[PDB]
């Protein structure tokens, strides 16, 4: 047919056959697209009404409620409707600020300046690993993972109560920073969204025109997705990060299209009649899937900034959620973040977990990132001996 488990040799030819196949399957894609657009528009309307009232768009939950298990059904519903969430006070402010200073002292101790939106190529600081295997992070990941329908029919697609250690970096942006930011896009695959057999199953109700039956919270088959090698090696239910510093409004902040089903619009857009044969509305090999005003005006107008944050808060967004980082000139305040996602245990993530453990043991850069291995001979590094039981399970040990 047109699907391919790995990068097709001639991606343009594969794209042309996929369009012919799916357009035939859809029958009247334009009509389907208009209805989906109207539905998405109801959400955009809700969002603008909230913004007009100065009301919060991003769902806001207190970590206190997550910890006590007192998040209401209405709150859970809201997160599922918006596809994102802010966890207030996930970690006390002084703990998050302490982590930031701890990592700086770690860098000084190992003379980083002599051996080396500045993204730090460090992964094994005490702060990073302790935050990752903390009871607070575990409670958050479990809660978020459970917003998904992970058990479908007679199969459990993933363990929502155990998330794998996904070693990532930290980003520090001091006052005065001027950055272009990052254009709107989605991760977890680009061309794969259309050509990967697994994604054809995930988005079956999108490509067959039964949008009413498409549920972005249905986990089935997402765990079978393997991004092309031209990259993320794990299945994430939510991307996310913890604020290491307070973050002020308008200062080049994270924005998202708080509509998880927006991906359906993205998937059908290239199938309309104003799209060149070979083109996929900006999608290109080895690049993140872009979302623009040119191809997705309805979606771009829904981009919504995170609200003001205090160090210790954490923000999360569904794996299909479109996000960006607005540009900033002469940034006020700091913009420090520690990236920590939610990747529930499953065959795919267990395979990466074994690799993570080996990298940790050596203090080397994780496979998904550039091979810099700065920490291989650093002192004060988090080691296997520092792992608590939760950390061990998160590493498939």
Question: What is the radius of gyration, based on Cα positions, of the chain?
Answer: 21
Helix 29-52 with 11-26: angle, nearest 10 deg:
90
The residue range of the domain holding 195 is: 1-397
Residue 342 burial class via C-beta count within 10 angstroms: exposed 0-12, middle 13-18, buried 19 and up? buried
Residue identified by tokens 């520092």 is 386
What is residue 184's DSSP assignment? E
Residue identified by tokens 């990967």 is 196
Closest CA to 227 of 200, 186, 280, 189: 189
CATH number at residue 336: 2.60.120.330
Asked if residue 29 lies in contact with residue 272, where contact means CB atoms within 8 angstroms, the answer is yes
Asked if residue 360 lies in contact with residue 125, where contact means CB atoms within 8 angstroms, the answer is no
Residue identified by tokens 């209405």 is 74
Asked if residue 281 lies in contact with residue 269, where contact means CB atoms within 8 angstroms, the answer is yes
CA 374 to chain centre: 26
Q: How far apart are CA 348 and CA 52, in angstroms?
A: 43
The shares of helix, strand and coil residues in the chain, as percent rounded to the nearest 5, are: 40, 15, 45
Q: How far apart are CA 265 and CA 257, in angstroms?
A: 12
Sheet of 60-62: strand order equals 60-62, 84-88, 314-318, 238-243, 337-339, 170-172, 118-120
Neighbour tally for 272: CB within 10 Å? 13
Element (DSSP H or E) covering residue 273: none
What is the four-CA torsion angle of 331, 188, 136, 163, rounded to 10 degrees?
-160
CA 308 to chain centre: 20
Residue 91 burial class via C-beta count within 10 angstroms: exposed 0-12, middle 13-18, buried 19 and up? buried
The string of DSSP codes covering 152-170 is: ETTEE--EEEEE------E
Count of domains observed in the chain = 1
Resolution in units of Å: 2.0
Q: How far apart are the first and last CA of the chain?
A: 40
Element (DSSP H or E) covering residue 147: none
Beta bridge partners of 23: none
Asked if residue 216 lies in contact with residue 259, where contact means CB atoms within 8 angstroms, the answer is no
Residue 210 burial class via C-beta count within 10 angstroms: exposed 0-12, middle 13-18, buried 19 and up? exposed
Tally the residues of the chain: 397
Q: How was it solved?
A: X-ray
Any alpha helices (H) in 269-345, and if so which ranges?
A: 297-300
- Count CA atoms within 13 Å of residue 207 on its CB side: 19
Asked if residue 255 lies in contact with residue 324, where contact means CB atoms within 8 angstroms, the answer is yes
Residue 274: which region, alpha, beta or left (left: phi > 0; alpha: psi -120 to 50)?
alpha
Asked if residue 375 lies in contact with residue 362, where contact means CB atoms within 8 angstroms, the answer is no
- Pairing mode, if any, of strands 60-62 and 84-88? parallel
């Amino acid at each position: 047919t047109f699907t391919s488990d790995t990068l097709p040799a001639d991606h343009k030819a594969a794209i042309r056959q996929m369009k012919h196949a799916l357009r035939a399957q859809l029958g009247d894609v334009q009509q389907i697209f208009n209805q989906l657009s109207d539905d998405i528009a109801t959400r955009v309307a809700e969002i603008n009404a909230l913004k007009a009232q100065g009301d919060a768009v991003w769902p806001v939950l207190s970590y206190a409620d997550i910890k006590a298990g007192h998040v209401t059904a209405e709150q859970r519903e809201q997160i599922k409707r918006r596809g994102c969430a802010v966890i207030k006070g996930h970690f006390p402010r002084e703990q998050a600020l302490g982590w930031d200073q701890s990592m700086l002292d770690y860098l000084d101790r190992n003379r980083f300046d002599e051996v080396y939106p500045e993204i730090y190529p460090i992964y094994w600081s005490q702060a990073q690993m302790q935050a990752r295997q903390s009871e607070e992070m575990a409670n958050a990941q479990s809660f978020l993972n459970r917003l998904w329908t992970f058990e479908s029919d007679g199969k459990q697609w993933f363990n929502p109560d155990v998330s794998v250690i996904y070693p990532d970096r930290i980003r520090r942006r001091p006052p005065g920073t001027t950055s272009k930011g990052l254009g709107a896009h989605t991760d977890s695959g680009a061309l794969e969204r259309w050509l990967l057999p697994a994604y054809q199953r995930v988005f079956a109700n999108v490509f067959n025109g039964n949008l009413a039956q498409y549920d972005p919270w249905h986990a089935a088959h997402r765990t079978e997705v393997e991004e092309y090698t031209v990259k993320c090696s794990v299945f994430r239910t939510f991307q996310g990060w913890t604020a290491l510093s307070d973050m002020l409004p308008g200062q080049g902040l994270l924005h998202v299209v708080p509509i998880p089903e927006a991906m359906a619009y993205v998937l059908l857009r290239p199938l309309l009649d104003d799209v060149p044969e070979d083109e996929l509305c900006g999608v290109a090999p080895g690049r993140v899937l872009p979302v623009s005003e040119q191809w997705h005006p309805l979606l771009i107008e829904a981009l919504t900034s995170i609200p003001k944050l205090e160090a210790g808060d954490s923000v999360w967004w569904h794996c299909d959620v479109i996000h960006s980082v607005a540009p900033v000139e002469n940034q006020q305040g700091w913009g420090n973040v520690m990236y920590i996602p939610a990747a529930p245990m499953c065959e795919k993530n267990l395979a990466y977990a074994h690799k993570v453990k080996a990298a940790l043991e050596k203090g080397a850069s994780p496979g998904d990132f550039p091979r810099e291995d700065y920490e291989t001979n650093w002192e004060g590094r988090f080691t296997l001996a520092d792992l608590n039981i939760h950390g061990k399970r998160a590493l498939g040990m």
